[model samples]
Target: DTHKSEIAHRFNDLGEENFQGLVLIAFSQYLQQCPFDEHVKLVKELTEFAKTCVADESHAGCDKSLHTLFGDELCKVATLRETYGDMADCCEKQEPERNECFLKHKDDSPDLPKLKPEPDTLCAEFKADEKKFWGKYLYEVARRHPYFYAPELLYYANKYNGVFQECCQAEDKGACLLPKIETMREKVLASSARQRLRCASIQKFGERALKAWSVARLSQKFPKADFTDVTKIVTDLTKVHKECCHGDLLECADDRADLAKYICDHQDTLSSKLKECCDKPVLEKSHCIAEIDKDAVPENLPPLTADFAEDKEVCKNYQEAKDVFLGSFLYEYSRRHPEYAVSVLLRLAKEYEATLEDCCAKEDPHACYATVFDKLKHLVDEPQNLIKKNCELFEKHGEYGFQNALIVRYTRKAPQVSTPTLVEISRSLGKVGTKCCAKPESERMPCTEDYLSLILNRLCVLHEKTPVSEKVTKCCTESLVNRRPCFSDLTLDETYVPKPFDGESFTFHADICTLPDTEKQIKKQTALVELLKHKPKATDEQLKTVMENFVAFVDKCCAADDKEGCFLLEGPKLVASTQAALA
Candidate 1:
């Protein structure tokens, strides 16, 4: 170590003694050796010596250092200005042509390459051997210059390790090669960072280049590579470059200016190459188109479902489907053709109203009629285009036929006792009959039976209170008469025949009835009277007993082989006997 220091000190002392030859010789020999720890000490010492030699303001040592370091060709060219200055006085005495000749050749030297060892091949070879070479190179530099570049080198080294691990299995040769490749990439990144260029621009260029290479390589590796994977690699390259070079490149104007042009040129070149490579696969073009189309899809479109008719997973799926389809159709149509979709929708709504009326007639008469009235109400109040359209369909196509029945069923009640308003009642009844008449004879028969059954059940209760009036009896008789044909055929066949019952007088013996039975009969009579009187007063026990008796009577009636014997009121008789006993 002191050998270098001693030589430097001797060289500086010689400069003070005006011994240029010794200083030149010492500095020249020092430059030739490979760098080591001692070389650092020597460089420090020599730097100091060079400063002292320059203090004399003489060009002698500078001339020697330049000549020795760069060879005579560079040295001669570099010294032209100094040579010209030295000959300024002498040039005045020389012939103009000779002076001009001297001046012309003074700085003339053999053309040296702009970049050493040829930039293209050197850069390519560096790329190929980058991992192995740059790893060692950076490690050495980082160890020696811990303060300057060590942190960045270590950081990059760690990142490279991560990428390598991800890309290849740990035991694989590819994995082993990863760290070195990463180091080289980091070196390029770091060098670019040091240049203080715009990192994003530089990263863009690098990423494009990487993408181009990856596309080319991937195409060769497989018939088709996943576009997603290719995209990921491109993104990863950009990320790596940014992580390494972000802060360094954006720091100064000089760096920005230099990097801007470099980035533009590099990006253009890399982009062209990437396109060329990716274009090789015809499938890739289709895939690209698909990706573009996928991205172009509207975000507002509704999701898909299987049970679109009645599923209520969210909303009623059928309703939701209608809404979605109609909404989308309207939107697109409006966008392209304006009022056309609106007009179409109005017409469709009318058609739907008609279909709804038909459905109510078959499926639910009451519901269908109610829906039609609601639309009529809407038409009166709003007169909306859709509502008007439906009204027209209702009038022209009988779309509201079932709806009319539902309206009558819901809105009208039986004629009031005092009012004797038979006109409205007759009108309603006629309307119902007319609708029933319109149905097929087979279907009409069931509808008539159902209506008659409902009326008979209510009339039975009324008949028990008061003798049937002529008008009530006539209506009841007509209902039965209308239903008689169907029942007649059924009764004629012995197996299906219902036996006719004769009106007869009967008596119940109270003494034969059980205590529970007697109590139940009394409660049942009480409830029937209370309901007829429209009285709300009734105890829970009374109601319970009534229900029990009702259930018992039904059971007995259902089990009975002889209907007359089953109807014998032993329970009412028992209740009478119990009252007598209490008295």
Candidate 2:
């Protein structure tokens, strides 16, 4: 009767002209509801209607629909028998011909939707006896249909973990059900979050079990159950409490007390039972305490430097040597009491050292060393002056040597004094000068020539030497009383002597006022003159030997009387006689 009503509704919805579509829609809706009947008549009617619709070639528009329904019905019937054995048997026996009818039309069928075991029905049936039902359903689903909708199924399986204790008295068995429950709880929590579902779903399930256990007084009757079961419930409750309780709940000391009590009550057995759950929740609460402390900065504390010195002095005098080692004790103390002046001081000291090293390495070594030494010198000069001047103010309390050591290390300076050499100074100067000269030309003079001139002047001053003209005294006085002229009056004519030869000629003639004609001319007139200029004390034999060579060379040249031989002339020649003449 219900099937016939549903069929009528389908026909009305699709219209009589779309009878094949209506028939297919009706069959699908029928399969979903799967309403039970008193006799085989409804099954026979439905099968006959399906056959008639499939046989009608006139209904070509609904051919695909007919095929889909045919296969769906066949697969549904076959798999349904396995899921609802007794119910399927009753339908099969009452209408054996309907089963054959589905098979008869099976050849024209499309891929069928696989039959799923009714989880709602299965859960409802074994509501009072959950272990058997859950175990059987899980095994069946896991073994038979492991691949389809796995995440959803896994989520469902884990979601039910909160209810496992209520479903079966697993706690009574004294079995290690905590691990299994915890594993499932974690998976469910992670999976629910991934699904973007409200954590309330997981919270709701956990809270429901908590309420049930509390109402049942399971914690009193089965104290072991508190270890096995109640621990997971408490952990999830803590998560829910933190999530739901935002700022107010987090700040409430009462809530923390309540949590601490819960942990303390079950600390013995539950400690070992669910160590991860118990530890993490408490650890999270501890972390929350730290976060609260982080936000509240104390206003009454002394400045960092004063506090550091005071603490350092106190630790040095009272604390054991082993406890007050260099930096280590101070660093650890800072971590615990961040509000303390000593803590800030220690941190600043470390930061200052690191910054100093970074800056020193990048800076010029000489400049870095100078800066460090200047500071050390100030400290050395006023070691007691600081205390005398500002006793109220706390400086970094340490021995002068210790402070010096730190400064030396930070600046990376050598302990011994290193005197700079002239070459080293020059190199350093050149380096500095180059950087200065790298500026625009309009801003600075050229450093290369200026630096060279400075160096040369310095050398000249040191040696007591002068670059003066050699010719000044050569023509002015005898070798006994040499009269050197000033460089200011020195002329080019006095400095540079011109050679005697011009064009082509032979036979050099000297001024008869100075020398005889057959005595010979200067061998190298320019060279001889230069020698006489520097050493004006040259004897007549040296001048005669030079002039004799020059005359012999001229005689040889006059023999040739050609342009090539003209180069041999020692001094200028008279134009009329074609002979050499010296002025």
Candidate 3:
């Protein structure tokens, strides 16, 4: 899995077609390389496809075949929306529309691995039973799976669309779907070399800040290369890291900070790779690689409860404990801090990882944290008292007597709300900080004052603008890790933002979300954004909700292209219907 993950990021820039082709081709290669079980699996895949071909309701003679396979089970499962999600929803309904509804969402789609590349004729390719193949197997996968993995492929997959219901949507049933598939291949594609690499990075790196950095930095080197081969891309990337730094260990903290130093010392060997790396030349590679931390290094890590290393502590025991925590990078430190013989209180402070992530992630994180601290107070190492004691110690000395974030709040002015309602309040407010500023700890304080400084400005600014409410006042007062709740409501407007997705019925693109829009696009998108702000980031599920409605709205109101001023059609509907339950 590690090998697959690391290599996958490198190939993220490839076009979707090439990506699937690579996978399919690799599968073919593996079949040849395999002895027994592998070959059986390959055969099993074809058998499964064959079974799927006849399972559809539209198939000409599939009644007997479908009955043999499903009996009443498919119908039962299809009716069960809760049990099987939408797949069963359609199965039970016996409704084409419901099935298509399910098909429209990528989250519900089945992956359509290549049955075969295009051929001269549809029946020729599927020669055994052209009618049966077209009438049956192709229907479920081509249409049924569209409801599966339909959206967000653009953000990362970049349009590696799943399934093919639309292939024959308006087509005559004879052999039209096959030809249709030829034109709109479900495979993904990229317009530029950098984009190709980004596509690769988007998937493997999970499509957020880390992926953004990979695409930007690497693209600078291979700016013009729309790299196709995943293997080659991974080889180039891994080879450079190995030759420059560690070999089999893959990557570690040393790879982060010290890797570049090793590369600079071995400059000559890495000279050529660096020249292609974000477009650096030989002389530049040594200096550039060595200075990975010089710029664009993570201001965030451990990615916004995470921490640090180095320097001698004035106290020997404290220094030893610090090194151990830093060495494990708190992943080990949080769960096991025995190696350092640190104070039990210090261990307790850093050790509570699971609950921090959980309790602090609620929409109202400050409230959640308040609840957790209260609930766990007695169960913990005298949590509130010890934490306050811990905070007060650092508060006086002023430099972090701490390494972990969750405990740092005690050193700051975190709030306590209870049966004790002390403040008679006018309560005028609104609000909302990070690496080590980017690692995401909700309502936790920072271990370093350097990071603490970064948040105060951002936090205080939001608070000033926000309407004073109990939630806002409480969140601001209770901010643990760099004003943890400040930026909570802000969505990844750019990251998950689509590249102007224009389609048959759906016209949602980047422009829809852009503010200060023309009156036409504003109506629908404002309704959309209202829904979106409910979550910090967009998900495939949420996008599907937005998309299906948009497409349906467009189908009724707008033309495929915006020439009709169709945006005017649905303003009242969106604002009114949804205005009433509300990502």
Best by TM-score: 3
lDDT of 3 by residue, 1-583 (tens): 2222232321232322323222222222212212323333433443343344324434433333211222132233223245333344444444444333332322211233445644333434344643333323323332322211111122212211222333323344346455555543432211121222222223223333222233223332322223232123323444333321111111221132233444444434323444333344332333345323211211122321223212122123223554333223322222221121112212233333334445434565444433332442343333234335435544553322122122212111212211011110100010001122223332222222222323332233334344323444544444322133242332233333322322222233333433343343334433343344333244545444554565466555434355234545454464443333232
TM-score of each: 0.13, 0.14, 0.21
The TM-score, computed over Cα atoms with residue i paired to residue i, of candidate 2 is 0.14
| RMSD of candidate 2 to true structure, Å | 43.9
Check candidate 1 and list the clashing pairs: 131-180, 369-403, 369-406, 510-573, 510-574
Query: Mind giving the per-residue lDDT tens digits that candidate 1 earns over 1-583?
Result: 1122332333443332212222222222222222232333333444554565455434344434221322222222223334233433323333443233332332111122322222233334345654433343333333222111222343344444344434443345453554556565645433323322223224333443333332332222221223444344334434433432322111111222223333233433222323333332222332222122101122353322222112233222213454333333223222222112122223333334354435534544334433333453243232234233433434553522323322222122221111112222222333334444455533343343333333332332233234323334344333322222222122111121221232321232322233375444343433333221221233334434544454565456435665445556444543443224323
Alpha-carbon deviation at 426 in model 2, angstroms: 46
| lDDT, candidate 2, 413-471, per-residue tens | 11111111122222322332333334443222223222322332232222222222233
Higher-scoring candidate on TM-score, 1 or 3: 3
C-alpha displacement of 105 in model 1, angstroms?
28
